[PDB]
Symmetry: D5
Subunit: 202 residues, 10 copies
């Protein structure tokens, strides 16, 4: 192929996967709760532009790697991979659904979140920890492992404290009400919506 | 858990896999033909030091990506993966076995696929990776080859369809056996675990 | 307003003008002719990714300038703006159409006006801009063109009068068709949105 | 010699300068957020002030206002380049606070100011905000929009609170009374009067 | 407002600039050692050209000649500010090469040029020498004295060979046909026409 | 000889020396009490990786220096070299042996600890001092000497106060229960387990 | 012709002007209340060395520019130039005279003009300059003063209208006489010609 | 012990060793042949200053390493250590005794003598250094040995080189002539920087 | 001449003068009082290494200067040069004699200390000030002059307050008990015993 | 006020300098090795040249020849400050090449020249060497010693080849005609007459 046969295939499967998930009206993904609110909303308001995230090479790397590593978790830890669930909360009155997909779960029960930075500075990153903390709440699990596979180091962290629904709720209204953007100062640097976004840190 | 439940396991398996590859006396790996001769012989003389390679996180990351990208190939292109073959050559007046292991092979005619990962997409494709693949095309008598890099800055795929001819494999082999030009590439010494005892280290 | 009443509308109108470029087969636009062949092909093959060029602020800005300076050229030089034509050439065996849209043509005798913005006034006139206009001379059978730069550090105008010969246009069209000379200019890969998947990317 | 297109742009731009001739007691809204000494110098050294006509970023900004303004007319039902004025007492004397709004949309009303900047640092710039808050008073609008078209980014801000009449008076006091020059530390770097000005920041 | 002294110096400087009336067919000596495109801009965009009047290094230079010229008149018995023109033939058409010498001494005469620079680097600079050598042929003089007063050093050079009338032709030609612009590669950096000039070195 | 006749021998004797020291379950080395508790536990959980330490050239230099300076001591100060001893302590009500080996002991006894660094910066280093102070406790010796042989300086320090047994017990607790890792901020930088350790300083 | 016709003369006349003034006993000049006390004493003790100040091209440029600007001041403002005067002050129960020479004075009441020339327009107006003029306002009992700079980057005029109070002048005078706090300004030693023998040089 | 017990003893023993070796008017050490001639003569003419080189901590470090590594060599390889020997050379019809002391010798390893020279430095840059190899090659002539090993123990690297060609006698005579006639000083460019005689030497590179 | 006729003689002469300083028993020079006490002690325990100081070229230059300048002080100020004297003090129970040698003295009495340096920075240097304040006490002089001949500056300083015994005694204390080592933090950088000294500052 | 010793030294240097009147057809040897214009300037601008007297470099250099020269009279039985002249023939006229040797040793005769410098870089400097080569001719001596006393090193050089008469005359030729200024490119950087000289290098 002019792109290359393997390249063409991975890009084609990754686009179909990205197109796969239409988000319901009142559903908030776990991953959205720990990202910039404007970014989340842009993903919904500017889907055509949002599609370019499919062609991010570190994303493709990360997916192949979750696939690699998830195989071994199935076959030695008897784990469930890519496990979805919902759980409701009420926000300013309205009922919102919080939707998450865990990289792996083990059945007490263990949630496993796999990450791959290109750098091992500062591990574990607060936003990766929060995410996992929220999945603990989501799946009502007692134990969490956050495991980083980076070129400079492999490191694994036990995270066992779930986030309190009270803060989950307040992370939620911050997402719905676009209250504080960006969520972390580093987000704008890599954000594809910074070309049009008024809130962009400069 | 001291090291971690997950990483304890990956380390255990990777140590196991490393110890499982025993090399015969007159056998040269394809990967040996495109790297420093002294390094190849140190890996045979100082195996207890060579074990330290098992723990290089880039190798662990690299092994997990092969496992992922290999399962996608097996699933959607009807590829065999981790395929071994041997082939004999005469070097000097003596028979050696060249052994290789393809990351994946596809039966259309056959296509040898070599997966590569790195932190950098600089200089792609690297000459020593292309040689590796060109040698596998002779080893497997295969018609076509794909070298595909998965790196954080770029996914890049190259088509290598020309095999190295046997006389040049023989000459690569001669270097290997007789320690002729060490290192093979000037960048190697910097990452070599043997540089600390090696007189030919570039400085 | 989430994005903002005015910006919402500009991005909406620019998305639609983008999506309305139904590309007919055997048709090569002048602006494709002077860019990297693989990039043109990437644009036809990964349209979902290519749409992201819609949101380039330099393109929105450049368009607005074009509109700005275009209203003036209509009402004072009596020119036609956004003027589409096409012309057939014989490339190898096959017959291809070269299509173009001049920014402005004043008639008197014809003059083709190409307007450019840029962040920098360094190196004016740029050789790809020049080439593009020299191709528009041939395409509209004009004998005079003007390249005008509106930059923050300078306003500069250039009289470009020699059209490109058909043989050079043909030689360029080959490269587009058979993916040769990628990239055309070494600076291109730096700003190419396909650099993340292209194996020919300069590094 | 100079070039057909640009010889025209410069001619046409000189005439638009030479046409507006500021009466004795007129202050432009743009003068209230500039350096008072610079305002005064433009009045006192009009042969030198002419040199501003040929700033290439002014020509660019003017071409952009044109293109964009014609889009505001065509699709938003807006009036472009809307002149108005308002008189005020600054210590017994009557001053004309004159202003030209880039565009207005009357249905009950919205002032839009368009800006072109070489970069997107610091958006919205406070002098630009203030200028817009002056126009809301000037044109008695309840709403304004500040829109930036820069090579790095497009962004848009909703400014809804007009400046107090008193504050505008104080601004005019500082303007005629030459009180705090420059108004901002970046001004002198670009000012054509720095070669004769004693207040120049070094 | 500007201050009592500077007002006067500038009004007088301005008025001396608007006085210089350039006849159709006349090229200045100083124009022969400058960028052909630059002297043309000066007649085509006079309103912009007026900003040179406010170049502080020019004011300072003037003030210098003023101070120095009592010395020249009293003790050297020279005429200062000596205007003259001469006729050359270029392209069959015939031109007036006109010049103003800082100071002349008739005895066998010696023309003298005075320069200020912030810097004594490279003295004498080649376009100053070239200038003196055109005043030598203009005034048909046998001796020239170029003298620099810089803050780093005072320096004086004897230029006693004039340019050949033949040479002067190629340079008046350059100036009319706008051939080699800019004449010296350092000109564009300081040129007030660089903002609209397509030949600007960049 | 591929490696070299002399080097092959040194690396064979180092490796066999390193393989000879197997640790019993309730035994802590004196060197362990002044190092990172995690690193200590890595050296016993990842013995195959730990073996790479045998090939650190600075260790080989160090050992040969010890051997040389050990021989001088023996033949002119009637010292015993490489003296091992063992003393028992109570931790969490359990019995551990602290085991150590002094480079040399003289005659009233003096424990000598020899160090070689490639730099004389900051001597004596706190962790080297503690080691020695522990050997005083261990050998119930009354004097300690810490001598550094570096390429920039020879420096000798008299250290005669032992660490009390309670400090030793505290150090042993940290070691058993991985309390504070790394013990010293500079450790991670040179630790062969950094590549798999979650506590690595970054 | 060795040195040059013009410069030879300029140097000759500058030298004479230097030797033309000899300082009175119990007299302090204003120019000296604003300079380092040791330097002022050095100028009496080491007149042969002090004479090198004559050849300082900055001073030459400086004198010429005072001449030209003065010429304009006296034929258009009807200014008096180089106006000498004195006042008496008590210091140490002893009587001293402060003397000075205003560059120009102009009427309306009197305006003291001080002219300055500097290489750079940095930090205008420099505090010591301002100080000099304030002392002249007290000396001439003038109520209004103009400091005017002619630099290559900029022309800048300042109205200074407060005179220094008499106590302060006395203090400046005490320092001058008792050599108390030298240098007066930290930047002085860098240019002082006596830095080579001065114990107090800042270093 | 104000200086310290161990330090005091090493310094005392090293000054003794240095002072034990008085050099005769017609001998040339091997070590001299690969050094600056002016410096070698300075070591005879300014012996009081020369003595400061005793207190160079790299040299004390260096000698302890030789001691310790040498003791390995006497055990497992049956080497002699610090082996002194002498060989004569003609230079302008004057006869000269070239004298050297090899760090270790293996007299008979399968019908071969091996001279071993041990070296230490703080960096492994550029190994092996040409003046080290020359020194080993002169010993090879001195002992008439067939094999040479130059081994570097450095903090970055251990590295061993097999050097088997001895310098011709003519080359050694050329080295000797320069030593005697003070011909080309310094011998190597990096010398003066470390040379304790640079403070009085006119040939010092700047 | 291998070394050279003149330098040979100079070094010969310098070595002789260095060697001819027989150090009496309970004796501390003034020049030792102002330096690190360990350095003083090293100079007494390692005579052979201290001899290298004889070949410091700045000390040779130093001595040639003192000679030349001292010839002027006899000649035109009728002063005694290289004047020697001592004076007992009492240190905590014992009796030591402080001994000094002043560069020049003029008889009331003026002690002159002459100093060179390649740099005039920070003059006068406190340790030179201290040396001379001690001379005034040793010689019962009332006035002192410190004169620096340096390539950038000649500078002379009047020092008229001598140190009292209490402080001199306290300085001798340090010299005896090896306290306050080094006295000044720049000393180790130049000290030839830093190669063996444990208190070297690093 | 300036200091007792300092005053005397500067007072004496001044007198010394002021003594030396150069007669009409004379050229010092030290003038043959210098810029011709500087030698000329020292004649035509005497007042300025007196500033050379206050060079601290030179005062140090003087005090230094005094010390060393008193060793030279007293151990090598030499003549310090030996003055002589020799007539040469240039352009028909007869000139007196005077010179003063720092010292001479009379056995068969040796000229000694002492130099000071704050740097030992590049010894021996070519122009110090020429100076001694001309002195060998002047005194017709067979041997010469150039000796430097710098603070980094003492270094002695033996110079025996006396300079040619023909090229001595070619030097005087340029001294007279101002043929090549400066002689050496480093000269202008320390020249007191660079402030008024048109030859100065920049
Ligand atoms: S050097 Fe500094 S202190 Fe000494 S006189 Fe000149 S200015 Fe005053
Ligand atoms: S090193 Fe520092 S401390 Fe040790 S002696 Fe020399 S100076 Fe005193
Ligand atoms: Mn994950
Ligand atoms: Mn265009
Ligand atoms: Mn030890
Ligand atoms: Mn003035
Ligand atoms: Mn002294």
């Amino acid at each position: 192929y002019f792109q290359g046969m393997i390249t063409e295939f991975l890009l084609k499967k990754k686009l179909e996967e990205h197109l796969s998930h239409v988000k319901e009206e009142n559903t908030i993904y776990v991953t959205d709760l720990v990202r910039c609110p404007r970014r989340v909303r842009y993903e919904s308001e500017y889907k055509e532009l949002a599609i370019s995230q499919v062609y991010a090479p570190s994303a493709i790397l990360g997916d192949i790697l979750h696939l690699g590593l998830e195989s071994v978790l199935k076959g030695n830890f008897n784990a469930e991979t890519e496990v979805e669930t919902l759980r409701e909360i009420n926000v300013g009155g309205k009922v919102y659904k919080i939707k998450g997909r865990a990289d792996a779960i083990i059945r007490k029960s263990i949630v496993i979140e796999i990450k791959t930075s290109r750098s091992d500075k500062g591990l574990p990153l607060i936003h990766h920890k929060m995410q996992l903390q929220i999945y603990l709440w989501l799946f009502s699990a007692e134990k969490g492992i956050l495991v980083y596979i980076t070129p400079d180091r492999i490191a694994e962290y036990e995270i066992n404290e779930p986030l309190d629904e009270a803060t989950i709720v307040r992370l939620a209204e911050d997402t719905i009400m676009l209250q504080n953007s960006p969520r972390f100062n580093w987000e704008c640097k890599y954000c594809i919506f910074s070309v049009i976004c008024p809130a962009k840190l400069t």
